[PDB]
Symmetry: C3
Subunit: 275 residues, 3 copies
Amino acid sequence: QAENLPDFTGLVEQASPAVVNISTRQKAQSLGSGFIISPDGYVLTNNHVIDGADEILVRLSDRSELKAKLVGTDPRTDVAVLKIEGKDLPTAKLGNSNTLKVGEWVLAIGSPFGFDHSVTKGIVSAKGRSLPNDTYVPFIQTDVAINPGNSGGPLFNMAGEVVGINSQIGLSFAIPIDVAMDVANQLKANGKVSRGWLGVVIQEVGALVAQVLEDGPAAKGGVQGDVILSANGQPIVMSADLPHLIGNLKDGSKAELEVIRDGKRQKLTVTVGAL
Amino acid sequence: ENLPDFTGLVEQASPAVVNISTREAQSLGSGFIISPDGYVLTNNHVIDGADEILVRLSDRSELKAKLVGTDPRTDVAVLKIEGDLPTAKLGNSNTLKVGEWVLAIGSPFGFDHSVTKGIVSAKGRSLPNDTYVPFIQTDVAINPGNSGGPLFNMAGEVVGINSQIGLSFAIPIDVAMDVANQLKANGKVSRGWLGVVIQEVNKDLAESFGLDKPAGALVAQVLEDGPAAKGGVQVGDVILSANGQPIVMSADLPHLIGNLKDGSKAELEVIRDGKRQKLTVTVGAL
Amino acid sequence: AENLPDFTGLVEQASPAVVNISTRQKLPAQSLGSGFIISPDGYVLTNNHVIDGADEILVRLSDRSELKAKLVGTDPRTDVAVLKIEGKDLPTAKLGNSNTLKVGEWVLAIGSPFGFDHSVTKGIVSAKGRSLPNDTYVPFIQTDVAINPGNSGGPLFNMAGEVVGINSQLSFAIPIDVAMDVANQLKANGKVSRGWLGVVIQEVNKDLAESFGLDKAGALVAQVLEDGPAAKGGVQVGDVILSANGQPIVMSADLPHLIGNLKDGSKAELEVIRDGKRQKLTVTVGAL
């Protein structure tokens, strides 16, 4: 049987070229991994790989070394966009992470310690939009091996399409490529991600306001202990349905939320903010 | 790729995997449904110390669980909820072969399932520090919250309980089902016990005897007030027979005696300073 | 509803030769790790770090036979050890080629961690090389098999059942080519002899190639030594050695590797860049 087991050698060969090493210099010190999403030198990575670096060097498989300026970064999704200078650079095909199915085979490729690629296989362990410690950023979980230096490299389906950005944090986490490409479009066009802001901490039940704030715009509209079942007309089946919605709202726009307090249903409007 | 994957197996076998929480609800681990009327398996060490036990299904229903019974030695616990629940098919762990693909499913933090693939790394009934529970070892990934959930063969049958207490450990489903039948019918596993603690027999400790095949159980510490003390057992005694069953394995001994009924005497054949003899012990319980 | 192939048949054919390595002396039966039989008359490979400090070495087969082992030889630098036990037609592991191992290939580590019983873990080839920021010599394979206590020193199998590495530990293995080289040396001489550098070197990126006039490679000596054979040759620190005895140096680790295979006392002709000028210096190579 075993000799008839398919393997990732062709996939490694076809999908490694676009994966790069991200380093900085004191003024060959590896910071992590990343990949090329366009032949003219746009590169994705993690915010936490480039944070604190000033001169950023991108190191290719042909072992070219290129100077990178930081196009933009988003700590909340932990996504960073760099730009280097080339023409017809090897570029990674991008896929859809919403069609990723739990149980599918995936392949992480990094360039952890200089120009060389390192490769690890696994499956999709889980997907979601939530954690007990956060209600914001959707995630993919895989049982791929954890490496220092692989963080920021891409996560491949068996067709060689990027389905995620392998961020390190025994299961390993990745940013769904749908979210990362969204964030990267934003950073590329504006330099920063804008997110509509609510002065509330929520918990599940709708979304159960567990801590409304002072000087939060929500306080200007209402008080704590309110189960928000819709905002701007969209049902809240999950508490995590709410922040992304508010996040996609433009600061200053009105948001109409329906809340239940004591069996009583009501509606309050808020001029949403940012950050 | 033409590589087969576990998506269909995940769909068929996740529904019966449940989250175990206590009392907002604090996730303790995973478990699975072994009968459509609500008997649920898990680890003892997932529910130890919990008082209010909540079982959280994939449909997001939450059900109250009474502790049917627990066995710390095998680390198996049986809970009961009230509902035609999705039920996990059970398999045979003795026919599990090292190198077979397996799939662990958990429900680690809330209603959502998490999944990891691997192979059977090893099987046994022994470790340098313990003789009393057989084990499966796999190279499945280790998760907190996956503990107590099932371990599936590629056909969707449970072959083990993922305990993981850098390879991960599972209780063979044969042993877990044995313990669960006992817990379900009596509330406690009753187990026959001998006072002496034994060690294996290698060719370095093969003296006090003329035995020329490393086998048996080398008593390393005989005890007081154990019925074994009444049998006439001395430290350095190689137990080759228990009730007629050969002891090629040191672990052949504990499991045998464990299934013995308390109060029933067990006739053992031992070699003491080269001489072969037989002494009977009224087995007890822990 | 999808059955991929598995490793059960591979486990059956390739486990028999994997053995446990133990020692016996101490104050209150001790497994040190794993190894494998590479010859039916009892030659056994393992890691240096498994037998280091042991006095009596015991080799334990799956048939539960226990055999006394004489230490044929060891090489800490590659972490390779060769033992000898006494048998005839012992189960023997087929050996393969590690240079043809491709990143992405499936591999199977087999160990015998605690006693006579075998443990098994699967994975792929994650990476290959001969260099790391912590060493400029040892070639390596990296795999994502599980890391186990007791598996170290056991073999790493390709899907055909040939040994491609020694699972030394992501997990590290010694490529079987290097290990067999080292084992032939230990078996015939008792020790591996290696030619001596006289200087520790560093890589050449773009910045250090602009530093000292280096157009576009080589090995940039980062620390020349005293009484090193290079010192007798005239090697000042900051020297890019591009060839030695005619062999191109594309990366720094090409160098020790070369010098390692040179016989002590033999000629070393090195081509260096010194403050923009090209030159050649001769060295009487040494040994560790």
